[PDB]
C-alpha cells in the first residue's frame, strides 16, 4: 503493498536535478542576482522529499457529535461536547478492549495500554499509548486525547504527521461511540 | 447513485473505500457527502480526502477545482498548505504525463505549460510557509522545474538560430537571462546569443557575451 496510496505520483527523478548556480560577472559588469519571479527561496530544511513523503490528507478530529466543535494542537485532540461524560467515556474505551493501565475517576482522567491500530492503507500498523480525559471546562465539556508514545514496527515514530494521524484516530473512535448512544 | 443513509455512515464508507486504494468509489461517496451537507460539521476533511483521492485516481482538474474552491473557503486553515503542496502535485502529474505521451515523438519546443503552473503553485507555498513540512520537497522540485522551463526557452532560441531569425534569438536568450540566470539551459544558450549577435554584425554586443561565457567556464 500500500505504499502507492501514501505517495506522490511519478518518479523520484526531480532530486537528481543539477544545483542552480548565480552567474559570475566579468570584470567591468555587473549582474542581477536571480529574483522576481522564478526565483527560488533559500531553506536548507528539512523535512521528507519524494517517496519518503506521506502525502495523505491531514487527520483531523470529527465532530461527529451534535453541535461540538473539536480542535488539534500538538500531540492533543480535543472535542467540546455541549456532564457525567466521564463514565461514558470510559465504558467506549472499554467496548473497544483498550486496556487501560490507571484510572483517576476523581480526576476523570486514565492512560491507556498500547491500542493496537489497523488500517489498509498502513504497511506496518502503529500503536499508540494515550492519556484520555473529560475536563469540566464549560459548561461545555471537553474529552481530550493525548498521544503520549507512538510505535510503529516497535521503533517509536514521533513525527508530526503520524503523532496527528494517531491522536486523531482515538478522538474519532471516541465520538463516534460517544454518538452511538447519546 | 449513492444511497441515502446518515452523513457519518457515509463517511464511514468513504473512509474504507479510501483507504482501500479504491477512488472512484471513495469520490462518489465524498461527492454526494458535500453535495447532500455542505454545511456538514467536519466537511473540511471532506474536502481534503477529495482532492486527495482525485489525485490518486488522477482527476487532475478535478482535484484542482477541490483545492481552489477550499483555499477561498478557508483562507486561514491550519492545513492549507498541504491544499498548495497538492495544487503542485496536480499541475506536475499533467506535466509527466504530457511529456509521456509524446514518447518518442516530441518537439523540443512543445510548450511545458503544467510545469510553469507547477512552479507558480510551489512558489506560493514556499513563500508563504517556509516552515511547511512539504516545502522542502516542493522547493526540489522549483529547482528541477526551473531547469525544464529555460531548457524550453533553449529550444526556442535553437529553432530560430537554426533559421537565421536573429532577432527572435537575442530577445528569448534576453529573457533567459532576465529570468533564469541561474540555469544550465541559460548557460548553453549564451553561444547562441553571440552568435546572433555575429550574424547581425554587432560586434560590441556579441563581445560582452563571449565575456560573460567565459567568465563562466
Ligand atoms: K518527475
Redesign the interface.
Known amino acids: 503493498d500500500s505504499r502507492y496510496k501514501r505517495q506522490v505520483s511519478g518518479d523520484e527523478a526531480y532530486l537528481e536535478a543539477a544545483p542552480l548556480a548565480e552567474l559570475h560577472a566579468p570584470a567591468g559588469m555587473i549582474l542581477p542576482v536571480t529574483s522576481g519571479d522564478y526565483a527560488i527561496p533559500v531553506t536548507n530544511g528539512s523535512g521528507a522529499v519524494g517517496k519518503a513523503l506521506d502525502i495523505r490528507p491531514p487527520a483531523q478530529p470529527l465532530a461527529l457529535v451534535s453541535g461540538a466543535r473539536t480542535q488539534f494542537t500538538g500531540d492533543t485532540a480535543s472535542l467540546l461536547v455541549e456532564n457525567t461524560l466521564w463514565p461514558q467515556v470510559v465504558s467506549v474505551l472499554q467496548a473497544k478492549n483498550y486496556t487501560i493501565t490507571q484510572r483517576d475517576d476523581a480526576g476523570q482522567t486514565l492512560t491507556t495500554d498500547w491500542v493496537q491500530w489497523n488500517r489498509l492503507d498502513e504497511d506496518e500498523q502503529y500503536r499508540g499509548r494515550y492519556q484520555i480525559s473529560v475536563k469540566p471546562q464549560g459548561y461545555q465539556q471537553a474529552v481530550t486525547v493525548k498521544l503520549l508514545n507512538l510505535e510503529q514496527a516497535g521503533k517509536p515514530v514521533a513525527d508530526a504527521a503520524s503523532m496527528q494521524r494517531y491522536s486523531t484516530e482515538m478522538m474519532n473512535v471516541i465520538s463516534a461511540g460517544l454518538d452511538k448512544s447519546a | 447513485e449513492v444511497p441515502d443513509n446518515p452523513p457519518?455512515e457515509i463517511?464511514a464508507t468513504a473512509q474504507?473505500k479510501?483507504?482501500?486504494?479504491n477512488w472512484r468509489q471513495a469520490i462518489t461517496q465524498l461527492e454526494a457527502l458535500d453535495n447532500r451537507y455542505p454545511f456538514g460539521?467536519?466537511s473540511?476533511?471532506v474536502q481534503?480526502?477529495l482532492?486527495?483521492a482525485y489525485?490518486?485516481n488522477?482527476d487532475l482538474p478535478l482535484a484542482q477545482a477541490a483545492i481552489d474552491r477550499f483555499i477561498r473557503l478557508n483562507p486561514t486553515h491550519?492545513?492549507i498548505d498541504?491544499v498548495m503542496?497538492?495544487r503542485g502535485?496536480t499541475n506536475?502529474?499533467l506535466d509527466?504525463s504530457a511529456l509521456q505521451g509524446f514518447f518518442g515523438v516530441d518537439r523540443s519546443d512543445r510548450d511545458p505549460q503544467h510545469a510553469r503552473a507547477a512552479?507558480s503553485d510551489f512558489?506560493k507555498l514556499?513563500?508563504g510557509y517556509?516552515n511547511?513540512?512539504?516545502?522542502?520537497?516542493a522547493?526540489?522540485?522549483?529547482?528541477?522545474?526551473?531547469?525544464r522551463?529555460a531548457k524550453y526557452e533553449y529550444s526556442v532560441a535553437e529553432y530560430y538560430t537554426e533559421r537565421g531569425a536573429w532577432v527572435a534569438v537575442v530577445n528569448r536568450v534576453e529573457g533567459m537571462?532576465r529570468?533564469?540566470?541561474?540555469?544550465?539551459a541559460?548557460?548553453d544558450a549564451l553561444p547562441l546569443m553571440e552568435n546572433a549577435y555575429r550574424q547581425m554584425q554587432m560586434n560590441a554586443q556579441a563581445e560582452?557575451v563571449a565575456?560573460?561565457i567565459?567568465?563562466?567556464s
Not at chain 2, 18 to 21: A, E, F, H, K, V
Not at chain 2, 179 to 184: E, G, S
Open positions: 457519518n463517511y474504507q479510501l483507504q482501500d486504494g460539521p467536519y473540511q476533511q481534503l480526502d482532492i486527495y489525485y490518486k488522477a491550519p492545513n498541504y503542496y497538492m502535485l506536475m502529474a509527466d512552479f512558489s514556499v513563500r517556509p511547511s513540512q512539504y516545502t522542502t520537497d522547493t526540489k522540485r522549483l529547482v528541477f522545474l526551473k531547469d522551463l537571462l529570468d533564469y540566470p541561474d540555469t544550465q541559460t548557460r560582452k565575456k560573460i567565459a567568465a563562466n
